[PDB]
């Protein structure tokens, strides 16, 4: 069995936080990655 296991919890606010972070980094770094 798995005596110590916890499913990861990622609420809606954390979802939007992560999506915003990823998209902001993408818009910031695309101009350099494309170069």
């Amino acid at each position: 069995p798995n005596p110590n296991k916890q499913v990861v919890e990622l609420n809606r606010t954390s979802l939007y936080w992560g999506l915003l972070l990823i998209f902001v980094l993408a818009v910031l770094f695309s101009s350099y990655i494309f170069n």
Binding site: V7, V8, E9, L10, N11, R12, L15, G18, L19, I22, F23, L25, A26, S30, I33, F34, N35
Partner: peptide, 27 residues
């Protein structure tokens, strides 16, 4: 730039999919 386009697409895809599947696991 094929390399840059592929990298940007991957960076958009994989973390978004990871976060979305995490949300589906527990909302």
């Amino acid at each position: 730039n094929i390399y840059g386009l592929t990298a940007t697409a991957l960076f958009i895809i994989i973390p978004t999919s990871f976060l979305l599947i995490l949300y589906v696991k527990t909302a």
